[PDB]
């Protein structure tokens, strides 16, 4: 659902908050991809 | 000859579209005139 929002942005990126909002949708998913990996490669917890 | 301020009160009586045309009714039109003429293409029914 954070990927659904990211693909819903405009094709052009030309304003300061649209840079910023793409970046807050950048790091929100990047910290999830780092997290989906640590809980996948380690079966035991 | 009363002035426009004394006439209807407006600065000018710019006369109206709706004074000189016949009422043809805006009842919903069947667009093209070819929607209703002679025999249309009628294939056979089942027997």
């Amino acid at each position: 659902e954070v990927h659904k929002e990211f693909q819903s942005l405009s094709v052009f990126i030309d304003s300061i908050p649209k840079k910023i909002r793409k970046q807050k949708l950048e790091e929100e998913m990047k910290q999830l991809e780092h997290d989906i990996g640590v809980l996948e490669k380690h079966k035991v917890i | 000859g009363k002035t426009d301020m004394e006439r209807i009160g407006l600065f000018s009586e710019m006369e109206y579209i709706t004074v000189g045309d016949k009422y043809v009714s805006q009842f919903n039109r069947p667009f093209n005139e070819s929607a209703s003429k002679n025999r249309q293409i009628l294939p056979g029914g089942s027997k």
Partner: protein, 427 residues
């Protein structure tokens, strides 16, 4: 194996083809995201035709989207089936081709055609064999009439054996949403006649007729007007996506339906159309489809086919039907009403029969007829041009991007050469 690259261009086309990518999406099962969550196996058998394939069991629509204004990208992306497309096919532009054929074909449009063809090369090359192209646009607009005809011309040189289909939105007699509309249409048809294999003509007024007289909808938007065009967009290409008792693909409906080479301005129609309350009171048997579809009220062009002669007709039927009833009515329509068909061709029918019906409906068919009534459609755009060209109309735009009055003389004359040959074989 046969695959169809769907180049969709122009605000209109970018919308009248987006619904296509929602109807074909459902016809093959592909859901909003892009995964296949359907039912039958056949749904996921000829997906290769319109859909590609991406890792993760996701079929991306093989469709290049082109609009010189980057605003209708946001409209088609924010639609229901809008995230399904891939971003690099969204080849947009910077400036606006505001309702002017010249700034789609000669100026600012010309600096995107290079960037469209490279994307067109990408989808075409990564493919075993191309059936052809398909352009969904509107004649009477800036980027549709302007770039679209140029984009037809470039791919016709590069790949000169592919079936060049086009679902063109031809201008309307009654109302005009554009006032340079006779200019853009007349100029464009010049390029279509020597660079296309099948031109399907769908104009808005005919869609207005079907959606109220036969469908009985009091509020028809520009969304349900695109649903009917998508249905006949799907119907022409169904015997190469789904099986049948007698198949007809796109080239089969090109060889069998163009008598003389220029006779490709066609006119479609969808057969099982019922209103909201008359759907239970009406039967579903084959005779009902055939009389409704050859009828003039269910015609997606304004040109009434009863002031003309059917040169060629197909009815690409779709359903679990009997071929003899889909043979006897085509004989009956050519014997009882045997004055409105030509005589130098004995039979004027391709009776294509697919097996898989569309969603919900148990039968359907799509009319495609090369009637001689098409000349009335093009004739009207001719006096609407020469009334403007005589007292030389809005041209201080059109010449200013760098063209000449010679092009306007030939565009009208080639279009007048066109309407005379539809009457040379009408009498």
């Amino acid at each position: 194996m046969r695959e169809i690259v769907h180049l969709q261009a122009g605000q209109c086309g970018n919308q009248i083809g987006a619904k296509f990518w929602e109807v074909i999406s459902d016809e093959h099962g592909i859901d909003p995201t892009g995964t296949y969550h359907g039912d039958s196996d056949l749904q996921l058998e000829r997906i290769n035709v319109y859909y590609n394939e991406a890792t993760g069991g996701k079929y991306v629509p093989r469709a290049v989207l082109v609009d010189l204004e980057p605003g209708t990208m946001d409209s088609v992306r924010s639609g229901p089936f809008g995230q399904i497309f891939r971003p690099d096919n969204f080849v947009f532009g910077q400036s606006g081709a505001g309702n002017n054929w010249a700034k789609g074909h000669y100026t600012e449009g010309a600096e995107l055609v290079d960037s469209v063809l490279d994307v067109v090369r990408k989808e075409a090359e990564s493919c075993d064999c191309l059936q052809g192209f398909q352009l969904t646009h509107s004649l009477g607009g800036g980027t549709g009439s302007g770039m679209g005809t140029l984009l037809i011309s470039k791919i016709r040189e590069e790949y000169p054996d592919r079936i060049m289909n086009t679902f063109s939105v031809v201008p309307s007699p009654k109302v005009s949403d554009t006032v340079v509309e006779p200019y853009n249409a007349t100029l464009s048809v010049h390029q279509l006649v020597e660079n296309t294999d099948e031109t399907y003509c769908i104009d808005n007024e005919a869609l207005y007729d079907i959606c109220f007289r036969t469908l009985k909808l009091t509020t028809p938007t520009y969304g349900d007007l695109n649903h009917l065009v998508s249905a006949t967009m799907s119907g022409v290409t169904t015997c190469l996506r789904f099986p049948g008792q007698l198949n007809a693909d796109l080239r089969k409906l090109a060889v069998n339906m163009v008598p003389f080479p220029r006779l490709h301005f066609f006119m479609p129609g969808f057969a099982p159309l019922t209103s909201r309350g008359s759907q239970q009171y009406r039967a579903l048997t084959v005779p009902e489809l055939t009389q409704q579809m050859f009828d003039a009220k269910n015609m997606m062009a304004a040109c009434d086919p009863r002031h003309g002669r059917y040169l060629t007709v197909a009815a690409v039927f779709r359903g679990r039907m009997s071929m003899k009833e889909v043979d006897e009515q085509m004989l009956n329509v050519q014997n009882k009403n045997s004055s409105y068909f030509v005589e130098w061709i004995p039979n004027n029918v391709k009776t294509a029969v697919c097996d898989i019906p569309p969603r919900g409906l148990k039968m359907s068919a799509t009319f495609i007829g090369n009637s001689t009534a098409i000349q009335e459609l093009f004739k009207r755009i001719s006096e609407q041009f020469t009334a403007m060209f005589r007292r030389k109309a809005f041209l201080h735009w059109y010449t200013g991007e760098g063209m000449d009055e010679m092009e306007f003389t030939e565009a009208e004359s080639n279009m007048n050469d066109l309407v005379s040959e539809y009457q040379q074989y009408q009498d």
